[PDB]
Each structure stands twice: as structure tokens, then as C-alpha cells.
Design an enzyme around this catalytic site. Sequence first.
Site, short mmCIF file in Angstrom:
data_model
loop_
_atom_site.label_atom_id
_atom_site.label_comp_id
_atom_site.label_asym_id
_atom_site.label_seq_id
_atom_site.Cartn_x
_atom_site.Cartn_y
_atom_site.Cartn_z
N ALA C 41 0.82 -1.21 0.00
CA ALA C 41 0.00 0.00 0.00
C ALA C 41 0.86 1.26 0.00
CB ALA C 41 -0.94 -0.01 1.20
N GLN C 162 7.04 0.49 14.56
CA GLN C 162 6.07 -0.19 13.72
C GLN C 162 6.05 -1.69 13.98
OE1 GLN C 162 6.23 -0.34 9.18
NE2 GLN C 162 4.78 1.34 9.51
N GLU C 283 15.60 -0.71 11.51
CA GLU C 283 15.42 -0.29 10.13
C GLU C 283 14.64 1.02 10.06
OE1 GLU C 283 13.54 -3.25 7.87
OE2 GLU C 283 11.57 -3.10 8.81
N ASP C 310 15.11 1.00 4.77
CA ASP C 310 13.87 0.52 4.15
C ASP C 310 13.26 1.56 3.23
OD1 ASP C 310 11.40 -0.60 3.49
OD2 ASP C 310 10.56 -0.37 5.50
N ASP C 311 13.10 2.79 3.71
CA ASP C 311 12.51 3.87 2.92
C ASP C 311 13.53 4.86 2.40
OD1 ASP C 311 9.85 3.01 3.08
OD2 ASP C 311 9.57 4.00 5.02
N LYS C 335 12.98 -5.42 -1.73
CA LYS C 335 11.61 -5.68 -2.13
C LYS C 335 11.55 -5.72 -3.65
CE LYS C 335 9.76 -3.57 2.00
NZ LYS C 335 9.04 -2.41 2.57
N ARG C 364 5.74 -7.87 1.24
CA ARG C 364 4.84 -6.74 1.12
C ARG C 364 3.63 -6.95 2.02
NH1 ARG C 364 6.47 -3.24 -2.56
NH2 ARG C 364 5.55 -1.94 -0.92
N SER C 365 2.83 -5.90 2.16
CA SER C 365 1.62 -6.01 2.96
C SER C 365 0.62 -6.96 2.30
CB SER C 365 0.99 -4.64 3.16
OG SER C 365 1.98 -3.68 3.49
#
Lengths: 423, 423, 423, 423
Positions: C41, C162, C283, C310-311, C335, C364-365
Amino acid sequence: MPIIEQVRAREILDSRGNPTVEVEVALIDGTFARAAVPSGASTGEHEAVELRDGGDRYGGKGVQKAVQAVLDEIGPAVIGLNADDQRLVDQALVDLDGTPDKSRLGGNAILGVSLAVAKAAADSAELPLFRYVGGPNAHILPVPMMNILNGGAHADTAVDIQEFMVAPIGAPSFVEALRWGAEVYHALKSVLKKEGLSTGLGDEGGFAPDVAGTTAALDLISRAIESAGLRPGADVALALDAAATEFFTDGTGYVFEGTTRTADQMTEFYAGLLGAYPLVSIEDPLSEDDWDGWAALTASIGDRVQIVGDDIFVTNPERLEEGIERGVANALLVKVNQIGTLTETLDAVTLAHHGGYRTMISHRSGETEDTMIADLAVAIGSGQIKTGAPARSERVAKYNQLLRIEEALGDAARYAGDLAFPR
Amino acid sequence: MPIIEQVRAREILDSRGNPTVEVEVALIDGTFARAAVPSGASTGEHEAVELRDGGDRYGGKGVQKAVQAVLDEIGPAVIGLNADDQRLVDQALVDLDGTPDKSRLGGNAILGVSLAVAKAAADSAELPLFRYVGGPNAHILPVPMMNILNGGAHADTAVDIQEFMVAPIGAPSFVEALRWGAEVYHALKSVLKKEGLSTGLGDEGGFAPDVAGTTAALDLISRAIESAGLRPGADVALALDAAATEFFTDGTGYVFEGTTRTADQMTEFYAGLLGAYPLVSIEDPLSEDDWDGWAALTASIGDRVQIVGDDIFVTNPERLEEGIERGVANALLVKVNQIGTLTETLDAVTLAHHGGYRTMISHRSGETEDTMIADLAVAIGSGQIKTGAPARSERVAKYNQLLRIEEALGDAARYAGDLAFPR
Amino acid sequence: MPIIEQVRAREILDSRGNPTVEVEVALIDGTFARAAVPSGASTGEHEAVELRDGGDRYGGKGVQKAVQAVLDEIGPAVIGLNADDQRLVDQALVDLDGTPDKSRLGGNAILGVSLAVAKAAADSAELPLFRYVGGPNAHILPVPMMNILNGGAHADTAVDIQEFMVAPIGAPSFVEALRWGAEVYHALKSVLKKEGLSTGLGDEGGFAPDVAGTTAALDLISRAIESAGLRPGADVALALDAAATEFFTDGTGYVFEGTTRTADQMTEFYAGLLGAYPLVSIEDPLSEDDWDGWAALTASIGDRVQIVGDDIFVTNPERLEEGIERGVANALLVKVNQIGTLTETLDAVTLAHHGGYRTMISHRSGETEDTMIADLAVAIGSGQIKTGAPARSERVAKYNQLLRIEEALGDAARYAGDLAFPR
Amino acid sequence: MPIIEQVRAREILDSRGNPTVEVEVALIDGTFARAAVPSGASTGEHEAVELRDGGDRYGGKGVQKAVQAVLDEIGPAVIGLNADDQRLVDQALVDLDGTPDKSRLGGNAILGVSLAVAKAAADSAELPLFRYVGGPNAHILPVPMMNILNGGAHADTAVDIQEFMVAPIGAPSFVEALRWGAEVYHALKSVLKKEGLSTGLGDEGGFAPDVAGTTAALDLISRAIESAGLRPGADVALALDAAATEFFTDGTGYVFEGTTRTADQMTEFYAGLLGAYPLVSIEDPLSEDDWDGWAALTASIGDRVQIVGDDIFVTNPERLEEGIERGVANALLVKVNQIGTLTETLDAVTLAHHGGYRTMISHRSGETEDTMIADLAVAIGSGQIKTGAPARSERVAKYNQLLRIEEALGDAARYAGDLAFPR
């Protein structure tokens, strides 16, 4: 791959000496099948019609036109479809025809191509036809109902019931059931001579005796069962095919034994029969339009015997649902050429199964050396079959194929004896 | 040839993090099929029992000795038999075990071999697993019954019904039914959040909201169906899984929402629900042993709604015949691991088909990525399936396989929408 | 030969009930594969974009457009190329699109064809997918980082971290690592219930309870590790996913625990965490664009713990090089659908290996039943994987595939325990 | 299947006229591969040991003992294992030997079986050797470092640098790089012949004339590069192989040019060289036991040039880690017969990749017509290779195989020019 490559039909003779169609659907692999189409004496208002030639050749019963239809239209209209998609090819054919009776192309050509592509979509997977059409759980061998004594609309004698049948329900296996049936047949063949009668075989191998009446016929059959070495009811049961339409004058009553009777009187006669004899099943007890009389008779004697709808339904689902509603005919009779394709037979037998109705794969008056109805009665697991007396090898081919089916199953097979007639 | 050559078994995790068995039957050609065995939250008193290890490894739920039973006994006990003979191999297994509930070898080490053999008697014939088990006439896609809102014995809530389900009966095809189900699911996910509630998924992907009373739950579901863009009853129906054994104190009554009630009161509750909402099916309405109450409730509402026997029958034919003759529960759930083999599954579903009962292939609490029950729900032509909400891809894998099935059929496929809920 | 013959896509549901693309690339020598494309998402600004339909079907998330991109354009644009030439086919696709983020054809319609031809360029050579992509030396089984507690942008809770993860670094093999992870996960399910909290699974199987601050969460995790039968640090380590972008107000600061902080305060919080708990990896500690704050953080704690980007990187090599330059985090998440092809995936992981950075294949989600990232984490020999908690079998399918891989290697396999976390 | 069926060994001659082993492995699937083992003279204390015969036959360099070891012991010890399991077979061999040097069976026999097994596995998968050993992403062609001027321990000359190499880093493709190398080689041949110097090829095809000193040699090489039509540094760069052990008297110092000096003055000489010339790499700049001097030199010039460890490491991982920790030799030199197996080769090159070290597949003094190291330098993606001057077709076979590799890749190939020498 199971994709059709060639289709070609020819004209052959059936067991009665009349022409019929024989289709040979080849596959792109080498799988080469062959299926002949049976044919009945006549056709009502709801069955699929046969496309006969008409004229002087073969008495007006030639099938050169159906052969030509297969060779010109039905051939390329399926060449390239998927064999295992019986619901694809059969709808393809039904739309290619375009009529509610398959009249434009004849039910016989359609059924020939249907059955041959089924025999190639079972030969392809190397399964045997009964295993394919029925899956993995196809294991039940049916109880053969052997019509040994013919009367009524067949031999024009003092008998009114059409077919008297025996059913070896007490046998341990199928092969012993076939033995008991053959022994009862050969015992009756001698009881007839020991009562000064004739041994002229009809169309089903059954006998055409000039016996007094219905009760005398059932008594003769019971004597033959006793002489065979068995016990009536515990070993061998009895069955009837009244075929009431053959003696019902519309606007008047049923003319039986020389007396005009109402539906109530026929029900009383059937109750008196159920009394003194081990009857397990009666087929078409009243006319195919007397729905109310059928509901009356079903409520009256429908808890002690099986009620088979032979003419009141013609293997048409649209009439079968209606007969389910009004409470008539707790059993169906599946004739494969009265509906025109394999898929519609399977759908109608499903619809009659899920309604509390037993079914019974049946034969036609003019059969061939094709033994598909045996595989089909094993696959759908009907637990009953009606394919004539053990004579006239168009009837015995079916029993031989059922013997081979039982041998091929082996330990898996089960004889559906006494689990098919709870009443 | 379809003769088994090599059999292996390993221990994997199911969708809930508990171990389970995975068997890999190999054939002489090279046909190599694997099948994982699902497992329920608890093993009752009539199911086949699972052979757990017991102890401290994996919380006492290890299956290291059901894995060993397959590699030391079942392997050579089936190696050499014929794949297409499900009856043969399944009777072989049932006798090799020798107990009335397969306890010696476990009802999970056997079912794995049964299934992985059926996945090779279909892979061999090059048929797809749904065409094999159901024959040529396997064409009906089932109505997905999606459990979107969980309550009762699943979460700490004032709700007493276990599973609330929606059923897109009005869709034109199966893919549109799946779309409608997913849209209702997301609409409810939005409605719960907008009405100050929680979105914690249970074991089936359904929601666990803190709502008060059954009627409020059905009202939320109707509001979600309205918000999705559909209309209740014409597009999407409703269903229930009362699971009333979870609140029937023996000798006291069905205590729930602060009212001890008799079997009669529950029938009144169900009648009110059926009136005020478009319910089509209720599952396990009263109890596992209240046979008389079940007959009463079936007489009361058992022709205006479907009555599913989940616990009162355990997919066992012996209890099923009793429930038929006593006239209770005109439907049953077909859970494949409560009976132990594919064969006995087909036999029980046949026995319940020929009795006027509709069936419903169902899932377990702990499933895997194995999509066999889809192929099995389309093969037996049940016309219903219960495999959870469109989430938690152990539940969505089944819907994806049904999409692939519908695509592989082509024009032959038919969606059993509205022809499975006549009442 | 490994030359592509057919390519066909369909639309299925992912683990969250949203549509996604599923491509099937057949070869001339049979070799029929399929590969489903995951979809997350939270899409940033440098990744490849997914080609959603937009509108009212499926809430505007339909992928009927990407299914056409494959059936009309991508299909013939590769039919005839050579499967084993990943570089060839992937450059073909990247040029056929022609945009810097594959937007014209969607970063999901392309990755499906890439992955499916890679699954057929291994099904062809009869190598298993992990052996092909990694060569002969592919033998390392990765440490699973199991996300058991969810917080931050996932549920209404006082936590800003998270994902809380455990990592069984002390196990002798991979099977025992999976067992320890499952046992810790099932122990925590009680420590929550034994404190009055909720057991509603998130999107990764991890729990989302209401705890007070990060420290209480880490203490619950340590209590669960103790209750499982293990010892923290020697058997099971800890890991964090600070999604600090989810609580960083640009120009204001990281609002953590209700107190506005700067990069220095967050570094102090992390350094205090590294004391009382055996953390091995964090992360996304600060933010995507806070490069200076990162280079200031990877120097204070960047020696005693792993720092995963990660981002701050999106698996883009162009961003990764500039990150390597500035002394930024020393690990990245791989990913596969943020880059668009298998080739660019391998190139980015190569570029990050030689820079002294460890990698971590991630999920992934919305995942599917496709277990490709397991094979990919074995092939590239990352020695770490992040694929959720042992629940929700779209997450457990990966662990089951890693078990199959480990027993298919045999004595060759090696568990990368405690060699993947030197600090 | 990729299971070994036969193993044979014979004794052949290498490029220098000394015997060596050639192993032929035949798989059960018709595959038949052949591999010959190179052999160098200079052998330290940590490499694998070659099992020579000893005596008077062939000057004591016979290898009948290794041939017999393969034919009697290794053959049946690997016959039956799985080809694609390189780690399986290589651990099998390493345990069958039982020693830390493989001296009981000789490193040459073991390496021959390892390499022939890898060749047969690649031939089985039908991939070419580079694609197998490297996977799908093997696409980089290495920069050929061509040794054109020999000195030091090779001939009687005032030079102490062992090898002077040119490197065409500025070429657009590999074929143009090979052309530039050959043109520089012939230009240097002409320059030497003009000055009445000797044109007698050494063991690598490079010349060894009596030049004044290192600076005069580099100036002669620059003149040859200019005479070819290229630009020194922009088109062709320079590289050294000092091999300082050949002039380091332990306890006295490096006797270079006739002036004994410490490591510091050697580093000063190297700094002057690096300043006045476009040197991109120096190999073994100091002795292989002077770790501290190596750390000093790496600090001094170890970021303006590549520091190749040829003797200080012997492709042994255990010494490689120790050289990593102490900050020396930011480059490795991979000789396949100094480690004994393909597996340990790949493991050591991985360990040196993940430490910031470039690698360089290298040749031996006695090579053969076996072109395996070309495939191996493409597969591991080293981006550098050292395989002699374009002469003496045992060196040119490698370049021809790299040409074929580039042609087989096609559009996928990439020349690693100027990306392999940042400094």
C-alpha cells in the site's frame, strides 16, 4: 491432446434388421473410437426424433441422410474442440441444430458423435469408460432386471402386462446374479414345454406364451424360480412393465382382462398383485397423461414398491421436474437416445437423483453390439439396469461387459443387491 | 502407468503456526504430487483422530510420528497399488490401520496419502483435479459463503452466533460473485471503523467487533451490503453458524444474552430473524445431541431456510442415515479430514445427496496453501462452499483456484447462484 | 529450448482482498509456470508504480488494465526471446515501457513476466528456482526475522515503533529456528491474554495490543522468549522497525511518546535501547530525507547494531550509491516489486553487497501464495529474511518453502545463524 | 539425471612440457566432460599440495600416482553423487582425503574431479559454464591485464618488478580491448627489436629484455602504447606485479636496484611510480610475512591504487579474514588450484567481495588448452582477469573463449572497463 481430428459415419444394421448410424471419431493422437446409435420402435411428442430417409429403400427407414449430415456439417463443426469438454461439444451440437428436437440433424447423428467423443475422451485418459464417466468412485454393479416373459402389445395374446421381469436381488456378487438369471430363464424355457406352450423369442429374448392372465403369468414365473433352485423374494424378486397406454382408450377406462376399469380399479389390481407376490417395481402403471391418477396410485401403493416412469417422462428434465412436483413416479428410466446427448442424460439423472428417485438405465428395442449402457449404468451408479433376457447377444453383450467391468474393478466392486429395493 | 513408486512425508506449519503433515506421492512416470492435511481446533468423539506427538516440542502438537507412520508403514503398504483405484487404496489404508477412527496411524497421515494419490490419478490422466473426481459433467461453480463477522466462542463479545456469512446469490458469474463478496467485506471494514469498533482479524479473516446482540450484527451486515452498492436479498443473502453447542449447558438450557431458553425459544428467535432478514441457511442451530429439538425446529422452519448439520453429523454416514430417517437438518458440511479418506467423503456426499440434503464443502481453522477443497466442491457439484472471508491467503487461495477453474471450463461453466437456495 | 511461446495474465486476489496480476509464461517444451505479483500500500516517490484501473470496480483497485498490457503488448514483445537471458528480456521490457518508473505498462504487469520466465528458465534446466538464480554455491538458509508485535501506523496504540521482531540466531539448523520462532509467537499469545490485552492479528500475523511505550513492548517480548523455554540474546535476539517517517513532522521533529524530539534525541533513545535489550538490527531509524541525521546516527550506534534502509532507499541503485557515499545505514531491504525486474533486483543487491552492506529480502503487505522470495533469499545468500509471523499462511508458505529447500539441499545446507549479526 | 557414472584420469603435458592430470567425467545422461589441472612451480606453505611421482621418470614430475588415485579411490567415492550439488561432492572429496592440504590424494586430482563435475553439471543443465556457475546475472566481461614485459625472478636483468602489465580500460567493448592489447604487444615487440634487444618469450608470452630499471621499463611501455595509436591512461593503463619476496632478504631488507632499504623507502618508490605513471594496480608490493609493512603501505597509497595480495594470501579464507581485519591488500588474486575445489574458490571470492576487495582470476605458469578460468571470471563477475600476453596459445585460448562468451551473451554483455579501477 484430446482434440478431435476426423469424424465419419456409416450405415449399418441394428439387432432388428433396420438401418442405423455408426460414427467413428478419431483424435489427433490415434485414439479411434466407434459408437452405434440404438433406435426405438416409435417416438412420442417430446423425445428427439430420428432422421430417417423415407421412401422405398430399406422400407423407408434408411439413414443415408444422417450419415450425410455427420459427414458434411457435424464433422467440421466439432473438429478442433476439446474431447474432455463434453459440455462444450454437446452444446456446440445442440446449437448447430437449433431446434428443440434436433430435427434438422436428427437425434441419432448427434448422439453418435456425442458417444464417440466420450469413448475417445475416456480412451485418451486411458481410463475405462465407466471410470471416466463416473470418476474414481464408480464401483457399483447394477441389479439386472431380466425380462423373461413378454405379453401385451407384443404377442397379441390374453396377457395385458407388457414385460414380466425377474431381479436377482439376493446374490452375493454380480456374476452369481447373472447365473441365477440365466438359470431362471432356462427353467422357464422348460416349464413352458411342460405346460404345452411355445418358445418363440420376442425382441428382448423373452418368451411369448399364450397363458391365461396376469396372475397366471406371475405364478408361472414363480414356478420357474422354484424349479431353478432358488427362493422367490429372498433370492429373486419380480418386476412389471404395465405399459398402460397400450390399453387405455381416452375418454373411457383401461380395458384390462376384458373389463373397462378406472384408475382406482387398476390401483386395486396392483395392490392385489403386491399382496401375493414379491414385486419390487412396476413401470408405467397408468397412462402418460393421467397425472392425477398417477398421484393417486403413487400415494396408494408408493410406499411398498418402486414406481418407474417410462412414458410419463421421456428422460426430459422439463417434464421430470413437473412429475416431481405432483408426487408421481418415484423412479426414472434413462434411455440415452430419448434425449439426444450424453450431457443431457447426466443432467437428467442428477435431477432425478436429488429428488429421491431411483433411476434405471434401459435399452431400446433395436440395439447393436455397442455396450455403452453398461459402462453408463456403472458410472452413474444407478444400481439397476434393464437390458433384456440372457439371450439374443445384443442383450448379452451388455452382461458380458458388466462381467468385465466387475473383473477390472476387482476387490473394489460392490453388487447393489437388496440395497436398491428397500421397500 | 498409475502405480505408486515412492512416498515421502515431512512436517510443515499450517495457517495458524501449528505443525501438520505433507505427503508427496510419486508415480513411476514422474507424476509428483503433494498434499497438505488441514486440522481443526479440536478433535471430537466421532471424527478420525490426529496423531499428535505430545510433549513439549511445538507445544505438544508435533507430528513427527505421523510423518514416521507414512515413511515406515503406509509407504510400502501402498507402493505398488493402482492410483485410479481410490476404493482399493483407501480400503487398503483403512484395514492397515484397523481401528474405527484410524487412531493407530492417525487421521492425518492417511488422508495425506489418499489426497496425494488422487492428485496423481488426476495428474496422470492429464485431467485437472476437478474433472477427474467429478467426471465429465463437472461444471458448476459454487456460491461462496463468506464469513465476514465473527462472534460467540471466538472473541470476548456480547454476540452469541459464531459466524455471520454473506452469500452473493444474485451474481451472473462466479468472478462477479467474488467481486461482490470482497466489496461487501471492505464496506464492512469501513463501517466498523466509522462506528468506533475494532478491525482485528480472527482465524477466518472475519472481523471481531464489540457489538451488542445478534440483531445489531445482522443490521451492520445489511448496512455494509447497502454501502457496497448492492441490495440485500436480490444480490447478497445472509447465513448463520449458530454453533449452539457452545452455549447449551446440558440440563439447563441455551443460556445466552442473559436468558435461559428451551429449544422452543431458539426456534422463535430463528423465526424472527428469518422474517426480518433475508437468511437462506443456518448451521448447527440447536445442539449436537438434541435430536428431538432438531426435528421440532426442522418441522417449524425447515422448509423456508436451509438447515446445515455441522456437529450433529460429523461427515459420518452412520449418523447421517439416522438424521435422515428422523427428519433433521436438510444439509450437511463436508469436511474432508473428519472422515479420513477421499472415498468415504464421496460416499457420504452421495448418501446425503440421494436424501434431499444439499451439501457444503467446508474448511478448517488451520488450513494450508492446498487448494483441493475447491476442486472437490466443483467436482461433487455441491453448489455451495464455505471457505472464509476474502483475506488471509490460506482462504483466498481457494477462491483463486475457483477462478482458474472457471477460466479453464470456458463457456461450459455455470454459476450455481440462486439455484442452491430455493426457499 | 528455453524460448517463450505463450504469455497470459489473469486477475486474482491478494492476501488482503485486493486484486493483483498473475502471469503464466509457457515454453515450447511444456514448462508452464505462473507468478503472482505482490503489492504494498505505502508507495513512495521513486519506486515503480502499479497500473491500477481506477473507478468503482474493486474500489478503484482493479488491474484489468495491466492484464491487457500483458495480453496485448508485453506478450508478443517477448514471445520468441530466450528464457535464460534475464538481462535480454528485462531490458526488452524496460525499453518497451520507456519511462523511468515503468508507469506506461505498470510495475506489476512487467514483474509478473520477469518472474514467470525466471521460473521457466529454472523449470527448464530442471534446476530448482533457488539453485538457478544463485548458481552452484547457493546453500545458505536465512535467519527469519519474525514480526510478532505491531505498533505505530498499524493500530490505535501508544507505540511509535512499527514492527517488533524476534530472530532465532542461536539455532543449530533452520528447522529449529522456525520451531523457536513459532514457540515464541505462541508464548506471546498467552503473555498478552495473561495481561488483559487483545489477540487480533494485523496484516503480518503479528499482534496489535495496547501497550505503554516501546520499553514495555520489548519487555513483553523478553518475557515471551523466557516463557518459551529459551534465553534472550543467546538463542533469540530482537529487532526493530522504527517507521519514524510515520511520526516525523517536517520542520517540527519526531513526535515520540508525546514529546517532540530531534535526531539527537532519537539517537539517544536508540542507544538506550541497545543497552537493556539484545537488539541486532533497526530499520528506517529516522527518515527518508534526513540524510545528515542518518550519517550522524550510523556513527553513534552504527557500530553495535545493524541499520537497515527501508525507505531512505527504495531498492533503487541510484539512491543506493549516494547513500553509500554519505556514511548512511549499512543494510537495505530488497523488495522485488519496488524495482520492477529480477535483473535490477540482482544488480542492486550486488551493488550493496560490495559496499559492506548486508541485505534482507522482504515481503509486502499484500502477498500471495507465491513463494519466490524464499528461493530468492537463498540464491543471493542474504542470510536474513523478513516475511512475517508464523501465521496467515501467505506468510507461512515462505517458511514451508524454506523447509523444502533445506531438505532438498541435504548435507550441503548451512543455517546462517549468528554469522549474520557480528555486532 | 546429473548423477556421475564414470570417472577416468590420464597423464598429459602442460604448456611447459611437464606432466599433469586430465580427468574425464561421464554422467548417466550421456554428458561427457573433460578438465585439465594447471600447475605452478612456486608453492608456499598454505596452498594445496600436488601429488607428484618423484624419481627419474619425467624428471620426478610424473603424476601416475594422482592418476591412480583418481582411478581407484576418487572414482567410486563420487560415482553416484549429484552433479549439481557442488558442495556435496566437494565436501565428499575433502573428507575422503582427510588432510588440511589434500596431500594424501593431491590437490590436482581433487581439483580435476571438481572441475570436470562442474563442467558436466553445466553441460547437463545445457547452460554454458559461465551461466551455470554465475546464474542468470552473469553478464560482465573482464578487463584483460596483459603481461607484456617480464623481469625480476624470470631472467637476468636489472629489474626487480616481476610482471609489467597493460590494461585497456578505455575500450567500448571486450573485442576492442583485446585488439588494443594485441596492438600494444606488437608495438612493444617492434620497439624492442629496434633497440637490438631480445625477443625471446618467457612463460607468459611477455618479453624480458635487459632494460635499465623499473622507470625505464615503464617508459618503454608508455612509448609502445603511444606507438600503437592510443593514449596512456585514457585508453590503456599500467599495472605491476612486484613479487617483493623474490628480493627481500629476511632481516636485511628489500634489495632493490642495488640499494638495501626498508618498507618505507619501497613505499616511497611506489608513490613516485604512481605519481609519474597511470598505474592502476600493484600486486604483492611487499613480502608476504610483513603484515605491518603491508598495513603501512595500504594506509600510504592504498586508496590511489589497487593493492593485490598474491602471496600474502594464497586464496585461503583463513588468511584472507586475517588480512581483512588488519587493513591490508584491498584486492585478492583467485588461483583455482591453490585452494583445491571450485566450492572453496567461490566461498573465498564471496568472502573477499563482501569486504570491499576486488578480485582477479589468475593463471598459472603451466596452463593447458583448458579455458575454464575465463568462464569462471565471467561467472563471479570479477571484472578483472590476468591470463598473460596475447601469445602462446595456452594464454590466447582464454581470450578466444571470452570472445565466444561475449558473442553468446550478445546485447546483454557489458565490458567492465574503467568501472573496475575507480582510483
